[PDB]
């Protein structure tokens, strides 16, 4: 006799996917979102008269779950200008910037990446079962920097691969766990060209908020925003959910999809398992932020890397024309490295990378400052991947989802969608009337 | 008003996927299956005390739709012994058999395959929009053999790649359209290692019938077996479907998922578009069949190619042990080349590739003989891919699905599932 059959906490892709599965099963589904908006770590906004993505933006057909969703809801891709580049730059730790011909830039980053993932085939023959091989659990004691040191690359190759890996870490490469990178590379077909195509090339048509809205509208679930959940208590046959205004909402099952780094805001009765509590105390590495810069000059199609001691770690063209100028999509590995609020400062840094450009605008999202992300994409530290199931395991009638809890594209939208599907399966298992299956 | 909201004709992966989408949308969904079994061109059966797949068998995580379904319904994979091979054989057109070192076999087939798809990246940057580039459009005037001739391969490499392409054609390579092959290679990440990993390595746990049963059970739809559909007639706001016992079932919308080569068995009133009728009259190339052989000796992990003029085109180990022996999974490009019901004849052909094998058993499925498949996997002839839209286009309140109508893995289960998702979306558009 609970208020709802299932309550999904979080309006991200994991929460929307879970709510859609549960909703189309006929359950009474309620979704609670702490922010006043949906999308979670994806954020569709506006800047310089265009639609932009402050968070997750790019998907690919080699990512199975999100692509299946796009086929279901009839969404294709929108291509960003990543081919036929006009300029390619590398900024080293000292701040010097070197312009390289795009062809040799691509060949060097290809060589560096493929040498860093030389054993991806043998370590991860099944990327969606990450602990399948004993050499993978055994390589969870090493960082990305540890391998980079043994690669023996050129100065430019090491700078590029360290910029890539620092960006994916949201931190310096000494803290970044190696198996997660090997596993993501394996997810993209064990081939650098395809994997690179998966990461920053194609956006969702109508925006990520379009797919979120498609799933939640299809679900028929009730969606409540500006309702943060502060505590969850398991009772017999159900759960009691308490919000920051102390209401009580009772449910048969609750699916937790909040980011790992935010679990400290919610109290659980009884306390979670020691493994899950340890994961909550370590959290996840990324400290990233996203910045868009509108410049009056037309720079064409530009791509740039910047090493971990510089702020503009990933630079890419969003749109360009004589009329417009250029809109730059920039991803920052660590928010500490730049005051994205001091716009002389970001202008100085931009002009440090592109000399003499007049800046017309920027807009930036600091995912570290947001109390409901407290970090950016999922980035596993050393030794964390091996304990991943400790995060996935259900605790009573509390299910756990989110990109951090996925087996495949854990740093991506696809991982969130996957965890949402798994959450829907487990919800069906708990609310199942005749045939009850809960293996592992 | 009508008997049902939606009627899905066909109990394959496309039909089961469509029935699942429509069923969980709340429509009253009825699915009609001509055979007494489900699965369509996949068939989970038994042989030599083991589970076997007479049709579609192998899936991969680089195939998005079927992998998403496996994630939803909690199905893992079963690995077949395809790595660390013990023997690799090539049988040329003359019937001579040559044993190659597995490493040299692997990079010879790698070289041939990657030279065959050297432009796959340019031509298909978006494999799920096959006509995105204009060079795909006019590489649709070429056969796969046309390119193989320009590759200038070795004897061995040409034998291997022509055996591969002949099996994927279900026909000789001179009739096989090139862009479909380039597009499938593009779907697997433009890389031969990944693409080969997608095709014959991993089966579904619990079998393909397990996934079909998961989808249809989830759907809540009504399923009728041994009910072939003979005619479809459009009235306003609905469709009239007539079975082979002359009952009439009225529906708001009908989803056709039957194989292309069987469309001659169904009359449409009004008649379909001239493009669709053209596709129905050309059909699709494949003439393949599948054969399992039980031998007393343990050959270990074996893989073998046979060129288009020999019958045992694709050979690989299904299971092996000293007590068991060996169970061989063999795919035959053209059923004409071997009489799979004469156990003695196929014993001779098996013994031609592995000399001195005592054969303990056989089991075979002839997909050409089945009136409800009349062919095997989807295989596009020259120029057919360019008209793919003609097959996909809806005609009134009749929607069309099936692996032949998919944009991606058209020769696979994943293509059928994709077409089922699109069919569900179009049903949602019509009934809202
Ligand atoms: C800048 C950036 C770039 C990235 N780029 C890409 C990319 O290009 N492609 C890609 O695939 N992925 C990308 N990622 C990763 C990605 O977008 C995430 O993996 C994905 O959005 C995770 O979704 P989620 O549902 O698992 O979690 P979230 O999206 O964070 O959802 C959790 C939800 O829970 C809410 N919440 C938190 N606490 C509470 C509480 N106490 N009560 C109620 N609600 C609460 C939050 O508001 C949020 O809505 C990027 C992420 C960022 C931030
Ligand atoms: C030997 C073989 C090997 C292959 N191997 C693989 C593989 O390893 N991996 C892979 O992914 N794919 C493989 N394929 C291809 C594959 O299995 C098909 O792509 C897929 O099953 C297509 O499904 P479908 O729903 O589109 O059509 P079908 O599976 O053929 O379903 C159509 C249904 O319609 C029914 N039907 C026909 N006419 C009528 C009528 N008039 N009235 C009512 N019903 C009718 C049929 O009985 C059938 O059940 C293989 C196929 C075969 C045969
Ligand atoms: C998609 N990627 C996965 C994690 C980070 C994210 C990314 C990569 C490059 C630039 N910005 C964001
Ligand atoms: C799955 N493949 C796709 C089309 C044919 C089919 C196949 C390939 C190799 C051996 N048997 C069947």
Swiss-Prot record, chain A:
Changing residue 377 to Y: 2.8-fold increase in activity. 7.5-fold increase in activity. Unstable, loses activity. Changing residue 200 to V: More than 10-fold increase in KM. Does not affect kcat significantly, but shows a small decrease in catalytic efficiency. It is found in: Periplasm. Changing residue 377 to N: Loss of activity. Its EC number is 1.4.2.2. Pfam families: Amino_oxidase. The catalytic rate is not significantly affected by pH. One of its GO terms (cellular component) is periplasmic space. Could be used as a potential therapeutic for the degradation of the critically addictive component in tobacco, nicotine. May decrease nicotine's circulation through its destruction so that an effective concentration is not reached or maintained in the brain. NicA2 rapidly reduces blood and brain nicotine concentrations when administered to rats at single or multiple nicotine doses relevant to the nicotine intake of cigarette smokers. Changing residue 412 to F: 8.0-fold increase in activity. Optimum temperature is 70 degrees Celsius. Coiled coil: none annotated. InterPro entries: Amino_oxidase, FAD/NAD-bd_sf, Flavin_amine_oxidase, Flavin_MAO, TAT_signal. One of its GO terms (biological process) is alkaloid metabolic process. GO terms for molecular function: nucleotide binding; oxidoreductase activity. It is an enzyme of class 1 (oxidoreductase). Disruption phenotype: Deletion of the gene prevents nicotine catabolism. (S)-nicotine binds at residue 331. Keywords: Alkaloid metabolism, FAD, Flavoprotein, Nucleotide-binding, Oxidoreductase, Periplasm, Signal. Involved in nicotine degradation. Catalyzes the conversion of nicotine to N-methylmyosmine. N-methylmyosmine undergoes spontaneous hydrolysis to form pseudooxynicotine (PN). S-nicotine is the optimal substrate. Has lower activity with some nicotine analogs, but shows no activity towards neurotransmitters, including serotonin, dopamine, and norepinephrine, nicotine metabolites and common neuroactive drugs. The enzyme is stereospecific with poor activity with (R)-nicotine as the substrate. The c-type cytochrome protein CycN is the physiological electron acceptor. Belongs to the flavin monoamine oxidase family. Overexpression of the gene has a modest toxic effect on cell growth, suggesting that the reaction product pseudooxynicotine (PN) is toxic for the bacteria. Coexpression of Pnao, which converts PN to 3-succinoylsemialdehyde-pyridine (SAP), can rescue the growth of bacteria by alleviating the toxic effects of PN. Monomer in solution. Homodimer in solution. Forms homodimers in the crystal. This is Nicotine dehydrogenase.
């Amino acid at each position: 006799g609970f208020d709802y059959d299932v309550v999904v906490v979080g309006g991200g892709f994991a929460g929307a996917t879970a709510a859609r599965e549960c909703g189309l099963q006929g359950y009474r589904t309620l979704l609670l979102e702490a922010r006043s908006r949906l999308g979670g770590r994806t954020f569709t906004s506006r800047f310089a008269g265009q639609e932009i993505e402050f968070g997750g933006a790019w998907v690919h057909w080699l990512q199975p779950h999100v692509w299946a969703e796009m086929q279901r809801y009839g969404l294709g891709v929108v291509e960003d200008p990543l081919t036929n580049l006009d300029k390619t730059l590398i900024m080293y730790n000292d701040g010097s910037v070197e312009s390289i011909s795009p062809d040799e830039f691509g060949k060097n980053i290809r060589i560096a990446f493929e040498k860093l993932c030389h054993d991806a085939w043998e370590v991860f023959p099944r990327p969606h079962e990450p602990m399948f091989t004993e050499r993978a659990r055994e390589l969870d004691k090493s960082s990305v920097l540890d391998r980079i040191k043994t690669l023996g690359l050129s100065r430019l190759q090491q700078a590029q691969i360290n910029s890539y890996m620092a960006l994916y870490a949201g931190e310096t490469t000494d803290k970044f766990g190696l198996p997660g990178v090997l596993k993501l590379f394996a997810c993209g077909g064990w081939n650098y060209d395809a994997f690179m195509d998966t990461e920053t090339h194609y956006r969702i048509q109508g925006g990520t908020i379009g797919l979120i809205n498609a799933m939640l509208t299809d679900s028929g679930a009730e969606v409540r925003m500006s309702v943060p959940v502060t505590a969850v208590e398991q009772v017999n046959g159900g759960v009691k959910i308490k919000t920051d205004d102390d209401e009580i909402i009772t449910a048969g099952v609750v699916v937790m999809t909040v980011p790992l780094n935010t679990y400290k805001h919610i109290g659980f009765t009884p306390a979670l398992s020691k493994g899950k509590q340890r994961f909550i105390k370590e959290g996840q590495l990324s400290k990233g932020a996203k910045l868009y810069v509108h410049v009056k000059q037309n720079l064409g199609r530009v791509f740039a890397f910047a090493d971990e001691q510089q702020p503009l770690n990933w630079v890419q063209t969003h749109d360009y024309s004589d009329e417009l100028g250029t809109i730059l999509s920039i991803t920052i590995a660590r928010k500490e490295t730049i005051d994205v609020n001091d716009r002389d400062a970001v202008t100085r840094e931009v002009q440090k990378m592109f000399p003499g450009v007049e800046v017309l605008g920027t807009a930036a999202y600091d995912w570290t400052a947001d109390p409901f992300s407290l970090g950016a994409w999922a980035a596993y530290g050393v030794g964390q991947l091996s304990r991943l199931k400790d995060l996935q395991a259900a605790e009573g009638r509390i299910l756990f989802a989110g990109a951090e809890t996925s087996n495949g594209w854990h740093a991506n939208i696809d991982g969130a969608v996957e965890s949402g599907l798994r959450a829907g399966r487990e919800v069906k298992q708990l609310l199942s009337l005749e045939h009850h299956h809960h293996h592992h």
